[PDB]
RNA sequence: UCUUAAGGUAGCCAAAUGCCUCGUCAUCUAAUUAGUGACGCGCAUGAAUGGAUUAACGAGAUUCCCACUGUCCCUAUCUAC
RNA sequence: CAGUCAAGCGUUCAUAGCGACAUUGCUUUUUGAUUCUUCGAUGUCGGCUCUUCCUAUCAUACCGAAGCAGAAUUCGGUAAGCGUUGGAUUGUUCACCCACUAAUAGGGAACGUGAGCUGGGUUUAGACCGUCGUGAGACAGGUUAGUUUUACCCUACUGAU
RNA sequence: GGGCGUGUGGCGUAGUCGAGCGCGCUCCCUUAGCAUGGGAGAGGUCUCCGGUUCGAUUCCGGACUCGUCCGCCA
């Protein structure tokens, strides 16, 4: 995350390595974005940085429209298909990865989002609660 | 603006100092050597670099 | 006025702020400033309830709000719902939804008269805002936007719609709400109305980066002079 | 040359040796530190390591995102029947280090006790502190000399006590006994203290209350011997690799030609005495109660002992400290709980905790249900239930 | 015109043949001393020293993509000897 | 890698920061020079793994100076306590880009480390091309394929009597 | 990486400290074609920036850019 974070995050099980693809949850047209880094991972000897939900990271559209392809973007992750634990202990999953593109500040490319998107995620950052449609 | 007699009391501790050339350190302004040891008691002094 | 607002930096005041004309809704995370505005502009007339809504600080895209009636998800839990019924007045009801969309406000743009909702609803939701909120509802969409409580910004006098709206889509809406509506901009140019800003028959609640025209425009399709 | 890429040391130095402990029952190093204000008090007590659960409580945490809202957390239950004082001792402190000069007994001492300094006790004639009890049934002579001794020397005076282990359900007989230091009053008042107390019973709330911070010292549950790979968590060699994988490579440069001590070597994994620091005690439960699980919520007389018992120990029908959290030391163990040697301000070391709700169900499986009458409300009747 | 008889024709190329060289341009990627397509004063390509092309075939050498996975993040557990 | 001198630069002003013409050193992570030891043989590239040491400190702690208003930055002191990454290409060390980060500092330990691994390179015998040679053959020119042995002894270290 | 040199009009290229020609094409005239030729055109921040000079392409310093040459291990 980093800069745009609208509070802090509890730490969630990092389910995204780098070089995951997960779906594009928004209507940018982009179909798939491809994870190449996470803010505010650290540096251990040979350890991925990883992503979980709620994380910032930057991305590549690996398919989609050809504006979008061959070029580095920030993006969100919604939807995280790796259980994590919260602080209620209900141990939660969605069934797919998925996550939007946004500016270095964190604001929307697209408009709407399809799908469901995670608590932990519509909190930290607020135009992505604005453009969720159901938030669980 | 703080007083002129307030600014010259202030600037007593801050200002009108001298600064040794090797060793950087902060001396009186009527030193004619440094009080250090590491730069060996040197007497290249320097007036304290003043603003306006 | 249009209020020039943060929340701890945040220039989207409807995301974590509910207004109607009779309560307030404030998230529990919120600094001085914050509750100040609503605390000074709003009075002793009108109270406001620090609330959380699902173990979430964003409170104004969960929940729809009445002068009659307050909306809530599933997720809220009865702590919660026990301390808004305490806190509320005995005139507003407060009714769990169970309905798969789950964020209402997002879902729902409504005033005290007419609502427009999101198309693919449930007909006992409908039912249930038509019941609780006594509101008649139409499904609609601004312009291809399914989320009409993010994309307008509503209240009695007037409304504030997205700003890439067809100029057909904009009298139509606006002869389906009996209200004039404009297409405008909020937050230096953010589209998202809705979450931008809260509104009522006398305050307007807006980021800091909200612009003079938009403020202008703000106030003159509200009526707030 | 130089290592070509930086990576933090893997293990920790001052654990060292790995080396299997001296004792099933870990030693307390250091005591909290008197003032001869406070009345005569002791400063630890021991029990038996029963097994976990889980607890909800609403957190209160004036800040956090989960303020006033329900968490659930892990707490482990300490089996603590009423120790007995038998003893005390006292310590003069010379040049060389703290040292004792004599231990007072008790007069009766019970089969549990004296179990302690046999090795085959079932052929035996018994005879101990026989001459010692010979010693006691005088008016006084032999006694309160040592005692005015202690009184007249002696900084320091600790309290030999043991456990009651025929109250639990181990199969053990054989009591654990122990020294705990005394952290009230002057020296007389202490050893008067000790003197009142000999034969009686001490219980576990005299020495704790909730909410208090506490540390637990216990030896670590034993795993033989171990490679590099799980005793220090050094990285897998690659799958190509001759002569096995599960190793570390480089043991050491040419010079010094001598494999160093900081080298990462197979061994003993487990099995060490530890003391873990910040526990926080939620709950001092009484044995002597029904609805020992029941709070102020819940309020289902259920005792704290799960369905079917606690898996490889059994029941808590004595007095019990639910603390939070893990603590050294596997089920059926004895472990020393001691107070904390400093005061803890912290704003989490002072957060007042009230439980809602506790755990009882089967924790041999995934168990359904709390209670028994739940379980048959569930279900209905059953062919074996006519 | 010389040298020494004739001076590289048709084709092909940083090719398993190009030192400089990680050649220049395009493409492939977030990023390519790799790959491919072009260019050619080619250290030192070239015509049975065989040149160019080529379907099918190859336990031949090389690059990319889909699927797949403990190769890896980051290790854990089980059986036999 | 570091001094000393101070013509100059730095609006003005040698020395905030620099600094010519000179000149004094330190180092042994460069490359040479030499040939002392080893030719009845000390396993010669790089990577992976792992420990420790040095400081000529990249970051973190506390400070001094400024051409230090704030923000950002630069120079310097005590300091090695603590950390110093994930990738594309190449066998590489090196390099060059992408990206994260507080920072992506430099080195030593028989150019640490092959009875620890690997064998891509180099460095046998097969084979192809170019140049050279009448030829056999040559080429730190290019290419492809090519067996990595033994610990049960002493010490050291890790644990156990 | 370093060394060594280099840089002029739209294009090519000449200059001793006192920016010129050709080409392209701007125009006009010229012509039985197998369409030429004549006359007048414009054009540079001399790679850039400083200093010396009275003035530097012309002298010099710095930077930039391009071309060359030499360079790692076993
Ligand atoms: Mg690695
Ligand atoms: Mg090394
Ligand atoms: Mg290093
Ligand atoms: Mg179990
Ligand atoms: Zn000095």
């Given amino acids: 995350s980093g800069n745009g974070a609208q509070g802090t995050k509890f730490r969630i099980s990092l389910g995204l390595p780098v070089g995951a693809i997960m779906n594009c949850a928004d209507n940018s047209g982009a179909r798939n974005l491809y994870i190449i880094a996470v803010k505010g991972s650290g540096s251990r000897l040979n350890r991925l940085p990883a992503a979980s939900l709620g994380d910032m990271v930057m991305a590549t559209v690996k398919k989609g429209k050809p504006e979008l392809r061959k070029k580095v973007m920030p993006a969100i992750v919604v939807r995280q298909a790796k259980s994590w634990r919260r602080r209620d202990g209900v141990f939660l999953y969605f069934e797919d990865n998925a996550g939007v593109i946004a500016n270095p500040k964190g604001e929307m490319k697209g408009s709407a989002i399809t799908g469901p998107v995670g608590k932990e995620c519509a909190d930290l950052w607020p135009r992505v609660a604005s453009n969720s449609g159901v938030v669980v | 603006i703080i007083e002129p007699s307030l600014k010259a009391l202030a600037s007593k501790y801050n200002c009108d100092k001298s600064v040794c050339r090797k060793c950087y350190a902060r001396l009186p302004p009527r030193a004619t050597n440094c009080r250090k040891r590491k730069c060996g008691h040197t007497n290249q002094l320097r007036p304290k670099k003043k603003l306006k | 006025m249009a209020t020039r607002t943060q929340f701890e930096n945040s220039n989207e005041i409807g995301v974590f702020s509910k207004l109607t004309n009779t309560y307030c809704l404030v998230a529990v995370g919120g600094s001085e400033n914050f509750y100040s505005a609503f605390e000074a502009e709003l009075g002793d007339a009108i109270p406001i309830v620090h609330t959380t809504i699902a173990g979430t600080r964003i409170i104004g895209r969960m929940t729809a709000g009445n002068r009659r009636g307050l909306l809530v998800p599933t997720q809220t839990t009865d702590q919660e719902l026990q301390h808004l019924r305490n806190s509320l007045p005995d005139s507003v009801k407060i009714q769990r939804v169970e309905e798969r969309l789950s964020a209402l406000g997002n879902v729902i743009c409504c005033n005290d008269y007419v609502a427009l909702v999101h198309p693919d609803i449930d007909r006992e939701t409908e039912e249930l805002i038509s019941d609780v909120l006594g509101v008649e509802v139409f499904r609609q969409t601004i312009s291809g936007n399914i989320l009409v409580g993010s994309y307008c910004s509503l209240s009695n006098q007037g409304g504030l719609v997205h700003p890439q709206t067809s100029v057909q889509d904009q009298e139509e809406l606006s002869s389906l709400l009996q209200v004039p509506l404009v297409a405008g901009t909020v937050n230096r140019g953010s589209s998202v109305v809705g979450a931008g800003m809260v509104v009522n028959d006398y305050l307007a609640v807006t980021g800091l980066d909200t612009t003079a025209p938009e403020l202008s425009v703000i106030e003159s399709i509200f009526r707030l002079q | ?386």
């Fill in chain 4, 1 to 386: 040359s130089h290592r070509k890429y930086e990576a933090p040391r893997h293990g920790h130095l001052g654990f060292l040796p790995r080396k299997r402990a001296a004792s099933i029952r870990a030693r307390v190093k250091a005591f909290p530190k008197d003032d001869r204000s406070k009345p005569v008090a002791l400063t630890s007590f021991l029990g038996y390591k029963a097994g976990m659960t889980t607890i909800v409580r609403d957190l209160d945490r004036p800040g956090s995102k989960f303020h006033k809202r329900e968490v659930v957390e892990a707490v482990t239950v300490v089996d603590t029947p009423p120790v007995v004082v038998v003893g005390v001792v006292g310590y003069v402190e010379t040049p060389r280090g703290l040292r004792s000069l004599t231990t007072v007994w008790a007069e009766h001492l019970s089969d549990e006790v004296k179990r302690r300094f046999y090795k085959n006790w079932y052929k035996s004639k018994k005879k101990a502190f026989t001459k010692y009890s010979a010693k006691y049934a005088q008016d006084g002579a032999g006694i309160e000399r040592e005692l005015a001794r202690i009184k007249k020397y002696a900084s320091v005076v600790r309290v030999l006590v043991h456990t009651q282990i025929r109250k639990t359900p181990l199969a053990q007989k054989k009591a654990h006994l122990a020294e705990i230091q005394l952290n009230g009053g002057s020296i007389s008042e202490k050893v008067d203290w000790a003197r009142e107390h000999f034969e009686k019973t001490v219980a576990v709330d005299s020495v704790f209350e909730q909410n208090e911070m506490i540390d637990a010292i216990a030896v670590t549950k034993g795993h033989g011997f171990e490679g590099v790979t799980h005793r220090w968590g050094t990285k897998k060699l690659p799958r190509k690799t001759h002569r096995g994988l599960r190793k570390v490579a480089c043991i050491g440069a040419w010079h010094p030609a001598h494999v160093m001590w900081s080298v990462a070597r197979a061994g003993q994994r487990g099995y060490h005495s530890r003391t873990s620091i910040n526990h926080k005690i939620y709950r001092v439960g009484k044995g002597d109660d029904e609805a020992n699980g029941a709070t102020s919520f819940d309020r289902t007389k259920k005792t704290i002992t799960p369905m079917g018992g606690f898996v490889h120990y059994g029941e808590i029908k004595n007095d019990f400290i639910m603390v939070k959290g893990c603590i050294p030391g596997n089920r059926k163990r004895i472990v020393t709980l001691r107070k904390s040697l400093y005061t803890n301000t912290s704003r989490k070391a002072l957060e007042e905790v009230s439980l809602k709700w506790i755990d009882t169900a089967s924790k041999f499986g995934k168990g359904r249900f709390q209670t028994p009458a739940e379980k048959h409300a569930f279900m209905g009747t059953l062919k074996k239930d006519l």
